[model samples]
Target: PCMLETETLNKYVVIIAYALVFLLSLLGNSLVMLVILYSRVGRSVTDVYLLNLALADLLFALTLPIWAASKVNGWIFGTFLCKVVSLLKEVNFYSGILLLACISVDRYLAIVHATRTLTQKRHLVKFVCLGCWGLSMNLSLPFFLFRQAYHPNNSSPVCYEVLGNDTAKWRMVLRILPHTFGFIVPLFVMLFCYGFTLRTLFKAHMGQKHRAMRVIFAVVLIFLLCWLPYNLVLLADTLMRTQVIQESCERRNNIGRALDATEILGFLHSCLNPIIYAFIGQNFRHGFLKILAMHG
Candidate 1:
């Protein structure tokens, strides 16, 4: 079956949009890390998570120009770069949501459960971050193994996953693993933690409770808005490929286009957290200003 051809306009849109995101994410996430790491404000467990999140986004942002160039010119960077870019992209996303889940859990412990023990165990957070990074790297290993630059029909080289014999079976296995660990589990943890956290906040009647929770709420909402559609679309594609859902060329092409558009939206998310932090986090603003003052 033939794949849907990406329109020239769509390609240009991807290139331009990715370029813009690359620049903004580079600046925004850099400042985020700088402020959180250097500011006089006491670094909480939440700050540790945010700093790691910024680092992940910053690393991911560095790969965007390669992807943007590939959109217009195809993958010219060769096999090693293909693997490296794919690895960074995958790690960024997995680590990002995992860190958000950690944040939610930390807040849930602090506010809903009033568990000061976990909050005080600041050293444990570093180990937890390390664990998340390790898991993310493990999940991304398949991409490193399978992504290669190939010339299709003697045209421009394209970098793509090339699972050997039994491609469908391996692809399905790989997809299911990441979807389960990377998306479903973390999503459940976030929703569960935040559900209790919000319920606790609602009952407290503290004037600043809502304000305090706003940033985390926005972060969760934006993450879902940006990623859920893409995940759903990818799930549909996987189902169709596995013959669980009836597949046809028309359906496949439509799904392919949907995946392209939705994935771009998801990619835009790397730059959004800093914007959320700037608007919703007073501490972030103060810390950022402190950095600016010193530099000036």
Candidate 2:
């Protein structure tokens, strides 16, 4: 209740920020999908990962407008949309990080181990992507189950997770499970894979090896930069709720504002994949230009 203060600045900030992200993410990720799907660029294991990553972002981007509207006007989209939008947002977040983890593993196999065992198994890639979607959906079910539109003080209806009665217990349980499976585990996997992958690259002395890894490295780095603070803030909030940390109304409000701000940063990350791809990957540009020239 203290968290829903809805400052005028907060409302306008969310609206403007999400609007920009929605537009850019739609345009950039659409181009990414077009180039990858239509251009003659031969698909590789990394490309497959990028494709799925873009798809996840695109799906997430579609929900930004709904959320932007909600920030300004409250949850006018009704209960059904509340659940669906929350599900899509949660699913995208998990799928995005998981796909990045998949990319790191692919790079590790290709570079550090020099093994084609997994990469060569194209059919398996499809299965892996499917499994990722399945896992993401499973993780997101809680959002769908708990999200509902509630009116506080007869004000505008707000769509949020409604954990009635044992809210403290349920909140802690929800936060710990999603944060563990969705963020913490994937982060560790990426770190492990990339640590070995980078070590091998440094020792190999192969010409342009670092160059090939540049885009992948940037993708992972940016993802960590974008999400780490948000998760840390969320973890702190969870700690406070669980009484692991002493809590005050002031502390709770401060954490709430931090969560709002950091979560915005995380949402901004939806559009960054194509930015990284465009600037860091030569092949991405080549494929993109090939599509434009074909159309021209």
Candidate 3:
């Protein structure tokens, strides 16, 4: 969809935007991790969850340089890296969502049940984290089984999964797996947990309960706002792939444009977590400031 006359301009924008995402997300999320790790916040269960979240995002951001280079040139990184990139992305996505769910569950348990066990349960938490990483690795392994890096005839190299030429089954699998494992299931878990947490807050009649409710509400809201459009747009794109609603070349180009724009939004989701934490998390502020103080 050459909105501009030159392909050079499109490539430049892609490079610039992805480079910015890579650098900014890495710096921001890493700072968050550093704060959590070094500022005594690491002792708190909530900080543990936030550290994992930042770590997941940091790992995902680490891949952006390769992608940015691909945007400018092509998939010059070999087939192995193609597979690795796909695996890393999926693992990061699902694992990150799971960590967010863990946070919600931890918050629920902390506030409602008043479980002091969380403070002393470091070993158990490590086991749980390991289990989540193991599950994420297994779930994302299918990409390595399916994805390949190849150059099309008379076209630049690209890395995409080739399940079968002209087959919708692969697309369906891609759509459903991520939606179910990454979005729908996690969303329901969060909603259920948060719902109970909020209900308990209402019943408790305390100022701290109100504050906790606000923080939980903010977390849920940010998660939805960050992911909702990407999921909805992907579903719409999959449906449109049937090509039932085609008219003119221009319309088809518009569809491509929209799909690309939606992908940008999805990619941008990686950069939003640290910003959300900075705004909503009190512990993040204090810990981050302490780190800054040590540096200064």
Candidate number with greatest TM-score? 3
Q: Report lDDT (Cα) of residue 105, candidate 1.
A: 46
**Residue 195 of model 3, lDDT score:** 66
- Candidate 1 local lDDT, 130-248, one digit each (tens): 77777677666655555322222111111222223346346455444554555566556656776676675655533223343444445445665766666565555446466422323
lDDT measured at residue 190 in model 2 versus the true structure, 0 to 100: 53
Where in model 2 is the C-alpha error above 4 Å? 1-14, 21-25, 36-49, 61-75, 80-82, 100-124, 143-170, 180-218, 234-296
Model 2: how large is the Cα RMSD against the reference?
Answer: 8.7
Q: Please identify model 1 stretches exceeding 4 Å from their true place.
A: 1-13, 21-29, 36-49, 64-75, 80-82, 100-124, 142-170, 173-175, 184-218, 234-296
How displaced is residue 176 in candidate 3, in Å? 2.6
Q: Candidate 3, residues 2-77: lDDT per residue as tens digits? A: 2223334343344355446555644655665566656552433235445554544544455445545544553234
TM-score of 2: 0.50
- Identify the superior model by TM-score, candidate 1 or candidate 3: 3
Candidate 1: residue 265 Cα off by (Å): 8.0
| lDDT for position 221 in model 2 | 51
RMSD of each: 9.0, 8.7, 8.5
